[PDB]
């Protein structure tokens, strides 16, 4: 049910502290993807637990334009043999890393 306010809250030439609001919604987890807006090489990804709304993206290249996407993910069933509920609600921002 739509996450919002994806934002870089703190940064160094090679790291970003990203933050978002889950809102009136509950997700099992978040899929974070990042890559140079360019970008030739594919996006890097990691998963953040549903209850956490903050993330550290490390090992970035300074002076590069990055696209950061957060997919809030619904992935449940009421039982092992139950109907699967699977949905992804994405939010994204563009951020340029600072010179060293």
């Amino acid at each position: 049910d739509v996450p919002r306010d994806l934002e870089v809250v703190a940064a160094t030439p090679t790291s970003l502290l990203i933050s978002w609001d889950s809102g009136r919604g509950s997700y099992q987890y978040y899929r974070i993807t990042y890559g140079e807006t360019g970008g030739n090489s594919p996006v890097q990804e990691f998963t953040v637990p549903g209850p956490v709304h903050t993330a550290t993206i490390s090992g970035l290249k300074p002076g590069v334009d990055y696209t950061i996407t957060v997919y809030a993910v619904t992935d449940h069933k009421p039982h092992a043999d139950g109907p699967h509920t699977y949905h992804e609600s994405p939010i994204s921002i563009n951020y340029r890393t600072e010179i060293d």
Partner: protein, 613 residues
């Protein structure tokens, strides 16, 4: 030793109920399990939940996924091997991800002090801020070299409240605090001489090829874990064959000591509720390209004839409720469907598209999806067809129309106002109920030749075939039935388009003769059908090549003779009676003869002579 088994799970990152339900079902599945046939997935386990039941696990056939857990400890203390018969995210046999909370606490200890082997796949470690000791681990001893390139290892904390490894650990590699948690090495520390594993650096200290993880001695009965199969107290490359070669009859007989493979175990009988496969394995359920059949009281997997039977809904019933036609959106759902439960409508609105329902035009290439349809329960109504297609091509495999439901409550087959030249319905064998309307097909030429009373199930079923191409102009422009067709009519001009042939047939085609004496692939005749001879039958001049199917029905062999069979090569390495291999050699007359009994690996000629030595 025989171990306690369990299925494992395939929920990946899916949550089942609340955190409690999810735990309860995790516990129900893995409680007292020693060998996991599937995957070990430990997800969403909250702080303070007890995972002590995991200590019993010692083998995982598929992959191990440990994600989104909040527990400080996952006591997989006795897990020896992950076979990686299945991967997580296309490459990982082990994936430990995001096991933390808002405070940056979570999984601290994963004391896998007995994990010595990962047969297939790589290892991914991502975003576990609380994890200790695992960064010291030398995965080169654990993982197969082919996968070291595919590893994904990310480790980080603060100091993360971690205890250092014991001084006794090699290169400081450990799984946790204490000397019992040191990494035991059995690959990287081996002598150059060693084939696989070892219980020390010395040449004496070397494991049998059939061992996995490690060993206690150098025999295939002294392995910690079996690299492939465990037959009672020994590791074997395969199970005793189900069939054996009888040198006397040259026939494959049922092996009295034959064993089915259940996981990485050799069994005389499959366990209750398990199905026998085409390769000797015990399986919970048959594959996608196969159906199950309780032949001789034993449930078995048989590769299904063509595409596997998929009964799915018609226009207006299931997903297709409120849909006026097979269209750009819905056509996807008809994928490998063989039977239609209800009606099929192909109307102009499909090809033109519809604004009101947000349906774009149908791409005529998409109609090829319907080639799997062999049965229509209801009726078939075609009011539109791509003008450039001369045939009802998509319906070439349609065998039966049932007419349970009918168009305007009358027709089971309605083919109206199309550019078609022929009804390409070569498989149409029965119209169980309903009437047949074929009108306004300006170029349609063959409908009138068919004996519809043959196809019709009941009398009372009638045809309304009018306003098509002039029956005289059809004749006039040669648009008639092939001379090989029986008077029973045709679906088009081709000899494959006949209802029945006047003589013989090869496949779907009516032919003037079978390749008995002259043809490219030589043939025999069965029920007025040209059946090929086995490729091992040597073609004959002025005489028949074969008397039936198989290499036991050749007049003369093309390559080698093994008693009654024609073979491309002599039997070599096939298992015979009393656990002794059958090896044959070929003589000057191309005849297969048994090798000297001392030729345990095979021979080139008779006696010890054609045997090195």
């Amino acid at each position: 030793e025989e171990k306690k088994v369990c299925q494992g799970t395939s929920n990946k990152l899916t949550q089942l109920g609340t955190f409690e339900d999810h735990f309860l079902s995790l516990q129900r599945m893995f409680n007292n399990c020693e060998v996991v046939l599937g995957n070990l997935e430990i997800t969403y386990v909250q702080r303070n939940y007890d995972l002590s039941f995991l200590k019993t696990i010692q083998e995982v056939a598929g992959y191990v996924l440990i994600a989104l857990n909040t527990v400080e400890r996952i006591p997989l203390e006795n897990l020896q091997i992950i076979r990686g018969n299945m991967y997580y995210e296309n490459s990982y046999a082990l994936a430990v991800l995001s096991n933390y909370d808002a405070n940056k606490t979570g999984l601290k200890e994963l004391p896998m002090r007995n994990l010595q082997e990962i047969l297939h796949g790589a290892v991914r470690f991502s975003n576990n801020p609380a994890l200790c000791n695992v960064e010291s681990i030398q995965w080169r001893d654990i993982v197969s070299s082919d996968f070291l390139s595919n590893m994904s290892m990310d480790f980080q904390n603060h100091l993360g409240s971690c205890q250092k490894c014991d001084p006794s650990c090699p290169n400081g590699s450990c799984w946790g605090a204490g000397e019992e948690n040191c990494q035991k090495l059995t690959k990287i520390i081996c002598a150059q001489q060693c084939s696989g594993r070892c219980r020390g650096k010395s040449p004496s200290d070397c494991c049998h090829n059939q061992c996995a993880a490690g060993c206690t001695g150098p025999r295939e009965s002294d392995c910690l874990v079996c690299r492939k199969f465990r037959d009672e107290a020994t590791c074997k490359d395969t199970c005793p064959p189900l069939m054996l070669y009888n040198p006397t009859t040259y026939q494959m007989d049922v092996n009295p000591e034959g064993k089915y493979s259940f996981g990485a175990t050799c069994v005389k009988k499959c366990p209750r509720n398990y199905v026998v496969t085409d390769h000797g394995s015990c399986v919970r359920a048959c594959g996608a390209d196969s159906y199950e059949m309780e032949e001789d009281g034993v449930r078995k997997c048989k590769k299904c004839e063509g595409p596997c039977r998929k009964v799915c809904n018609g226009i207006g019933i299931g997903e297709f409720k409120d849909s006026l036609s097979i269209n750009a959106t819905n056509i996807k759902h008809f994928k490998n469907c063989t039977s239609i439960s209800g009606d099929l409508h192909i109307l102009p609105v499909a090809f033109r598209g519809d604004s009101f329902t947000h349906t774009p035009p149908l791409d005529p290439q998409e109609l090829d999806i319907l080639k799997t349809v062999k049965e229509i329960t209801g009726f078939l109504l075609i009011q539109a067809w791509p003008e450039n297609r001369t045939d009802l091509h998509a319906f070439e495999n349609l065998e039966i129309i049932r007419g349970r439901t009918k168009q305007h409550g009358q027709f089971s087959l309605a083919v109206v106002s199309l550019n078609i030249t022929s009804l390409g319905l070569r498989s149409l064998k029965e119209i169980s109920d309903g009437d047949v309307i074929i009108s306004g097909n300006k170029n349609l030429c063959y409908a009138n030749t068919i004996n519809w009373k043959k196809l019709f199930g009941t009398s009372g079923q009638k045809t309304k075939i009018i306003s098509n191409r002039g029956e005289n102009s059809c004749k006039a422009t040669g648009q008639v039935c092939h001379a090989l067709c029986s008077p029973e009519g045709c679906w088009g001009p081709e000899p494959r388009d006949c209802v029945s042939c006047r003589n013989v047939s090869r496949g779907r085609e009516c032919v003037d003769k079978c390749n008995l004496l002259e043809g490219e692939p030589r043939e025999f005749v069965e029920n007025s059908e040209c059946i090929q001879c086995h490729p091992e039958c040597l073609p004959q001049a002025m005489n028949i090549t074969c008397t039936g199917r198989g290499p036991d029905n050749c007049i003369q062999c093309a390559h080698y003779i093994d008693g009654p069979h024609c073979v491309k090569t002599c039997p070599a390495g096939v298992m015979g009676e009393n656990n002794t291999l059958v090896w044959k050699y070929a003589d000057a007359g191309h005849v297969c003869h048994l090798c000297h009994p001392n030729c345990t690996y095979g021979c080139t000629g008779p006696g010890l002579e054609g045997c090195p030595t």
